[PDB]
Design a protein around this nucleic acid. Sequence first.
RNA 1: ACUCCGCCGGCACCUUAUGAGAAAUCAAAGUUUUUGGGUUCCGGGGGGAGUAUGGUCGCAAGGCUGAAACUUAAAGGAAGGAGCG
RNA 2: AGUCUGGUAAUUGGAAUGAGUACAAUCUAAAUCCCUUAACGAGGAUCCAUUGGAGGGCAAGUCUGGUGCCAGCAGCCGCGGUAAUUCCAGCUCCAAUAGCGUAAUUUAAGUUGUUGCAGUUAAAAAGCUCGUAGUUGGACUUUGUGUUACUUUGAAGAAAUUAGAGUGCUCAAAGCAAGCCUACGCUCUGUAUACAUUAGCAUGGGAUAACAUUAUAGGA
Lengths: 25, 141, 184, 220, 82
Amino acid sequence: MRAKWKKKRMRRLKRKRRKMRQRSK
Amino acid sequence: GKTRGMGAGRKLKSHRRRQRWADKSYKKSHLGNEWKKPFAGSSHAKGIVLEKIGIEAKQPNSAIRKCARVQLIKNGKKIAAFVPNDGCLNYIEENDEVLIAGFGRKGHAVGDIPGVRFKVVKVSGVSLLALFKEKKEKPRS
Amino acid sequence: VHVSFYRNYGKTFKKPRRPYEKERLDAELKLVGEYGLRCKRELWRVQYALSRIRNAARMLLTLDEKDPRRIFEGEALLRRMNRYGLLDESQNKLDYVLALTVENFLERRLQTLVFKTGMAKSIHHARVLIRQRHIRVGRQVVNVASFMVRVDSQKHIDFSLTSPFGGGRPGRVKRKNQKSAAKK
Amino acid sequence: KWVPVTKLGRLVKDGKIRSLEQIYLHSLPIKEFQIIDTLIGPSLKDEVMKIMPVQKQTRAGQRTRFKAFVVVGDGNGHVGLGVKCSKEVATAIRGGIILAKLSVIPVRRGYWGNKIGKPHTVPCKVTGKCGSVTVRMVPAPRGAGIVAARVPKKVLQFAGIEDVFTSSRGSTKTLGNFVKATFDCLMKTYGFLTPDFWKETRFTKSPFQEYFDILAKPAN
Amino acid sequence: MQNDEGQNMDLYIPRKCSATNRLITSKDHASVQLNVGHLDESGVYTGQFTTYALCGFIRAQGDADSAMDRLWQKKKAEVGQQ
RNA sequence: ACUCCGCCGGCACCUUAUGAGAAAUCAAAGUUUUUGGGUUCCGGGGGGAGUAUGGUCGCAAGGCUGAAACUUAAAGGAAGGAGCG
RNA sequence: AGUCUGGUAAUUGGAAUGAGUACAAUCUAAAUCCCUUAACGAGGAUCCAUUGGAGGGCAAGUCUGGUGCCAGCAGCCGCGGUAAUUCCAGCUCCAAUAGCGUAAUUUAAGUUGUUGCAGUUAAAAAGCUCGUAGUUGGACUUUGUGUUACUUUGAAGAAAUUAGAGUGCUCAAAGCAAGCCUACGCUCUGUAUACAUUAGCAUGGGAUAACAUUAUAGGA
Ligand SMILES: [K+]
Ligand SMILES: [K+]
Ligand SMILES: [K+]
Ligand SMILES: [K+]
Ligand SMILES: [Mg+2]
Ligand SMILES: [Mg+2]
Ligand SMILES: [Mg+2]
Ligand SMILES: [Mg+2]
Ligand SMILES: [Mg+2]
Ligand SMILES: [Mg+2]
Ligand SMILES: [Mg+2]
Ligand SMILES: [Mg+2]
Ligand SMILES: [Mg+2]
Ligand SMILES: [Mg+2]
Ligand SMILES: [Mg+2]
Ligand SMILES: [Mg+2]
Ligand SMILES: [Mg+2]
Ligand SMILES: [Mg+2]
């Protein structure tokens, strides 16, 4: 996978964690 | 380039201190994570045979490597121990005391056996080598 | 505390770094068979001893020739080599110590001298004679084949007074055969 | 038989030149291996270091050629290295022996400390490079032996070196560059200008100038 | 070179470049040894000459021509040539 | 303004090896086992991973700092005369 | 052809000898072991040497039977799918040998680089500049009671260990003993010496280097 798009995939995955963790705080 | 000053003793010493961590061998011994391994820094360990299992040999080889799931008596951790030699699995019964050792690569997998880093040395207080060569027999029956 | 814990002991040989070098295996077996050695260990300790002597000489040679330590220990080392027949009075320099070889030390063994003085038929015959209490160096019986003879002692190698080959009574084989012959 | 095609071949055939040092002094190329067999022939000793197959991809398959590394030397200050590639193992060895003779060099030897006995070690620190391989030779005391790997050790023995310390850096498993780097530092033993060479040079006529009349006459 | 007794221990003594003083090794095939003939009052070759050796290093640099010119401008004034 | 000679400074280019290099190539990427002018940053097989976690900055997007378990025997770089080959 | 020398055989011969066994003495606080020694004690001298290997690395077989990608081997590369040098066996051979195999740390590692490594493309120059601490700083002063570093020599420094002198415990690892002659004893017998970072103490040296100082001289 092109490195730029793998970087994009990880950033999306980090947003969900950032939102899936602040949901319970 | 390198710092060369006669009064640069501190910087050279502290630079090497930081850079030794980049070495994998150095970091494996000074991290302290060896104590969390199933042997916890020991050369051998006794355990109880939970079940006799077979593991598919890794490619391009094709075989069923005879292993045994073992729970270590001293810490209760479960490991897979390869049973060497031909027909030595017949000498091992479930819920039996076995002495385990490393596989020879210091916690790394060996050969075509996937994810196996231990081997069986003794069973019921008798070495598999003695049983294989018919020197001794297991103490039962 | 145990007093016995203070007794010193050390190692007398090192194994080779490369175990299966064909050239070395050929040269070592030639010395082993030439001098009737028991195994490679006997040859390795002689090499170990030789290395110690050469190392001492090299350190001395690196010092100034006027250094008192160079003069004192250098003379002692040369005196030690002369007393065992390794060096000659015409080779009184540390540089000649560096030229010593394993054959020089193996030639001073009691086994080698018992054979090269005519007392034994072969280098392997000398080995058995020594271990069987047939040889003496002066007044003392020696049953160690690795005994390193001194120049002042080489002329006193003879058969033991208790041996059948040195005036003693015949061994138990001849005596029993004589007894059997008498019974007839 | 031998029919020399070079001036040196004729003089060596005639017998005017009777030592390799007379050729080395004038840095003359040696293009006939029979010259080496006539001057140090009986004392030489060849030895095949390795047989190396090399392959060239082709439409039908892969063409395999064999590459032979040969070292020659009398063990008294002369050593040569030859490498030849050929389709047959035997042909490569025979040609490698010829190439090794044609490259024979003089190897200067010196003393570690006191000049007692015959020279036994290199006269100075010398280093040789080939590819990524660098071989260093440091003078060693008598009896130290050749402290080197198998490949340099074989070359040093044929050159007549008895005691030397060596160290290596780079890909020594590339035998071609390892042996060549060893041979590279052995030829530098005569290139380093020590104080004992400070004496002014006394030139002598070259063999081609000394025997011009013999060379002028055609040989039949 | 010389043993403690005095015997020579070198195979040979390599020549030194007349310009740079570098040793000339056995494989330096770019090195040349040159002879400059001597003349008499009339200007005829007398069988005498001066020898110059040049290493491959200096000849490859292109400095052999100027090096030879200087070495001859001095030597000829010493042996009477002109 | 143009023509000719030269000096200092600058962006570069061309030829060449007596140099260096695994080579491509480089007048510096030279003056390195014949190893030392001064100083800062920074790398230690491939992955896991610039991920988890803690801290800090930001309105946010994210930035800076930054692991381990585990996995793997390769991943990667250059490619008679001439070239280490 | 010849005859001198060397090598093999569970052939044939007489010799040698300690493992063992044992009168004894000795040893010891008493025993025991060792040392010494009467008798006894070897021919397939069964008084039977083992542990790992034999594709490469790496010394040693393209032997024979079995198995057929199974069972297994294999630290790594790999071997095994019906003609296996690699598995299971026999034979033979190899290495070490009364030892050898297997499962933290040193070496190899100039893959931690002070000595001594890297950073154009292989892992690696911060996007750029400023900037404090740090580190590093041109030349010059005599050649022909300002304070320090450095260097020289010395003093003080536990032994044991290490290096090392002397010494024939039968050798050796060791030990610190012994030797000399034959008397009512002797060699005053020996039990040396070096090393020992850094800091501290004290002499000599003053190149190199650091800090301090200088013109309303509070000068000599
Ligand atoms: K360091
Ligand atoms: K310009
Ligand atoms: K060609
Ligand atoms: K070094
Ligand atoms: Mg620099
Ligand atoms: Mg260019
Ligand atoms: Mg450097
Ligand atoms: Mg990495
Ligand atoms: Mg060609
Ligand atoms: Mg087999
Ligand atoms: Mg082999
Ligand atoms: Mg078969
Ligand atoms: Mg194998
Ligand atoms: Mg590493
Ligand atoms: Mg590196
Ligand atoms: Mg890239
Ligand atoms: Mg990169
Ligand atoms: Mg200055």
